Design an enzyme around this catalytic site. Structure first.
Site, PDB file in Angstrom:
ATOM      1  N   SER A 181     -20.149 -25.461  71.787  1.00 17.41           N
ATOM      2  CA  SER A 181     -18.826 -25.119  72.315  1.00 17.41           C
ATOM      3  C   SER A 181     -17.713 -25.771  71.491  1.00 17.41           C
ATOM      4  O   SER A 181     -17.654 -25.555  70.284  1.00 17.41           O
ATOM      5  CB  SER A 181     -18.756 -25.552  73.779  1.00 17.41           C
ATOM      6  OG  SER A 181     -19.892 -25.057  74.480  1.00 17.41           O
ATOM      7  N   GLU A 297     -21.887 -15.338  77.853  1.00 17.33           N
ATOM      8  CA  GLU A 297     -21.339 -16.621  78.255  1.00 17.33           C
ATOM      9  C   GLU A 297     -20.090 -16.611  79.130  1.00 17.33           C
ATOM     10  O   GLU A 297     -19.982 -17.412  80.059  1.00 17.33           O
ATOM     11  CB  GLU A 297     -21.077 -17.516  77.038  1.00 17.33           C
ATOM     12  CG  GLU A 297     -20.831 -18.958  77.473  1.00 17.33           C
ATOM     13  CD  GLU A 297     -20.618 -19.928  76.327  1.00 17.33           C
ATOM     14  OE1 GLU A 297     -21.322 -19.816  75.304  1.00 17.33           O
ATOM     15  OE2 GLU A 297     -19.738 -20.814  76.442  1.00 17.33           O
ATOM     16  N   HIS A 392     -19.324 -23.630  78.640  1.00 18.31           N
ATOM     17  CA  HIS A 392     -20.570 -23.205  79.268  1.00 18.31           C
ATOM     18  C   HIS A 392     -21.736 -22.736  78.401  1.00 18.31           C
ATOM     19  O   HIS A 392     -22.338 -21.697  78.676  1.00 18.31           O
ATOM     20  CB  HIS A 392     -20.256 -22.119  80.301  1.00 18.31           C
ATOM     21  CG  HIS A 392     -19.159 -22.490  81.249  1.00 18.31           C
ATOM     22  ND1 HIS A 392     -17.825 -22.408  80.911  1.00 18.31           N
ATOM     23  CD2 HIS A 392     -19.198 -22.977  82.511  1.00 18.31           C
ATOM     24  CE1 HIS A 392     -17.089 -22.827  81.924  1.00 18.31           C
ATOM     25  NE2 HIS A 392     -17.898 -23.180  82.908  1.00 18.31           N
TER      26      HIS A 392
END
Length: 479
Positions: A181, A297, A392
């Protein structure tokens, strides 16, 4: 064997699960007081053996000690401090450039070190208002780099490793940087940074790319203006900027809510150009990469912001256009054709967010690197894994083989299956760091390198397999 001599002094580590670990090593001088908002400086050397048995505090963030501006520390896991020149995995945590730390238990390097005979390094870097407050020239040239201090901290940590990892049994010429991320966005940025060139040999980007959370100067400056107002700081008032308590400055920034998004800024000072564009010009030619995404996602973002699941189709579409638009009609037709009859409406459209925020960035990065002649290994993580978070990605526990670690979404069911996938990803990541190739008997079938001809990608799931140009139809819909 627990004591190691670095360029700055001796450090005493500890034994754990058969491997050695050194916690809370300062890689730069504390950016407090007069050093706030300034690039990181080399740490001061010390006499005697400094204890490195406890984690250092984490950087300022919304809240094991308490968060502190004095949080530029790194941690090291190694099978042994000798001269075996082991591969070095350098981890950059995610957390939307707002929260997180390298000392979090889900990044514990014991498994990697024990299973692959590699050295693991995890770091802290300045975040939110302390690491990404774009001041521009508002407070003088000394603060022109404030918008990317978090990135500069990462580079400072990387230089520390390049310079001292040999003593911990690592090879400074075989460092692989990886992150997830925001951490993957950080890797993407470093891949394009001239100042970081030569500091690492390979990179792995898990569910993120150089475009994730990237901001333009105008956008960053607008956010800064709102933050300074909330904090009661008049533009150009260096005095208040440096004397305002850390907690108060943090509270001011957070009061703007999830509207304010932190991240690197193409400020022309640290980042001269878009991280991905730079790759097209050979900024990272010769740097192999392993890159991938978590299937659908953006659906995970609705858990943090349920507002998406309560908007009409037209009202939902408009919000998406506002954030990642404009969306061509060819694209819309594609998503209506692939929609799932049993799935709710928002899931059909949120796929636009998944593509614009995560897929496109990865594809552009892979195409840029492949065009440079560098090896690229692409993947899609499909395994449905259970779940308060800002980012996430779902691959982490399988990659680190930290399924046991607390905090991890460790729930009952499918233990043998969870283990199988971890044994695939953990070892594939270890293989890539070791030799630049993730292949081996740990994979059900061979993972072909990503080429413009085939555009092959490995799919990790209960029955992992290879798929040719899986994002092809979608990409064509947009392009």
């Amino acid at each position: 064997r627990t004591v190691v001599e670095t360029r700055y002094g001796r450090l005493r580590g500890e034994m754990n699960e058969g491997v050695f670990v050194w916690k809370g090593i300062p890689y730069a001088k504390a950016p407090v007081g007069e050093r706030r908002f300034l690039p990181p400086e080399p740490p001061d050397a010390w006499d005697g053996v400094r204890e490195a048995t406890s984690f250092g505090p984490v950087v300022m963030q919304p809240s094991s000690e308490a968060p502190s501006e004095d949080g530029l520390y790194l941690n090291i896991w190694s099978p042994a401090a000798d001269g075996k020149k082991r591969p070095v995995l350098f981890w950059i945590h995610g957390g939307a450039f707002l929260f997180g730390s390298g000392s979090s238990p889900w990044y514990d390097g014991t498994a990697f070190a024990k299973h692959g005979d590699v050295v693991v390094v995890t770091i802290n870097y300045r975040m939110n208002v302390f690491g990404f407050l774009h001041l521009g020239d508002s407070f003088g040239e000394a603060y022109a780099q404030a918008g990317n201090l978090g990135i500069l901290d990462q580079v400072a940590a990387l230089r520390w490793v390049k310079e001292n990892i040999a003593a911990f049994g690592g090879d400074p010429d075989n460092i692989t940087i990886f992150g997830e991320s925001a951490g993957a966005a950080s890797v993407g940025v470093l891949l394009s940074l001239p100042e970081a060139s030569g500091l690492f040999r390979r990179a792995m980007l898990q569910s993120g790319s150089g475009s994730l959370l990237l901001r333009s100067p105008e956008t960053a400056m607008a956010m800064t203006e709102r933050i300074l107002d909330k904090a009661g700081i008049r533009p150009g008032d260096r005095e208040r900027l440096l004397s305002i308590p850390a907690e108060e400055l943090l509270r001011a920034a957070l009061s703007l809510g999830p509207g304010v998004m932190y991240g690197p800024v193409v400020d022309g000072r640290v980042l001269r150009r878009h991280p991905i564009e730079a790759l097209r010009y050979g900024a990272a030619s010769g740097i192999p990469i392993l890159i991938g995404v978590t299937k659908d996602e953006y659906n995970l973002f609705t858990l943090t912001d349920p507002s998406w699941t309560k908007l009409g189709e037209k009202e939902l579409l408009d919000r998406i256009n506002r954030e990642v638009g404009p969306v061509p009609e060819e694209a819309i037709r594609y998503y209506k054709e692939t929609a799932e009859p049993s799935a709710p409406t928002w899931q059909t459209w949120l796929r636009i967010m998944t593509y614009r925020v995560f897929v496109e960035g990865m594809l552009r990065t892979a195409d840029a690197q492949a065009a440079q002649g560098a090896d690229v290994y692409m993947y899609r993580f499909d395994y449905e894994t259970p779940v308060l978070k800002a980012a996430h990605a779902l691959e982490l526990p399988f990659v680190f083989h930290n399924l046991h670690q607390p905090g991890v979404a460790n729930f009952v069911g499918n233990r043998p299956e969870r283990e199988a996938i971890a044994n695939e990803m953990h070892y594939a990541w270890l293989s890539f760091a070791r030799t630049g190739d993730p292949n081996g008997a740990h994979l059900p079938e061979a993972w072909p390198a990503y080429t413009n001809e085939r555009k092959a990608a490995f799919v990790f799931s209960a029955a992992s397999h290879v798929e040719d140009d899986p994002f092809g139809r979608e990409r064509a819909a947009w392009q």
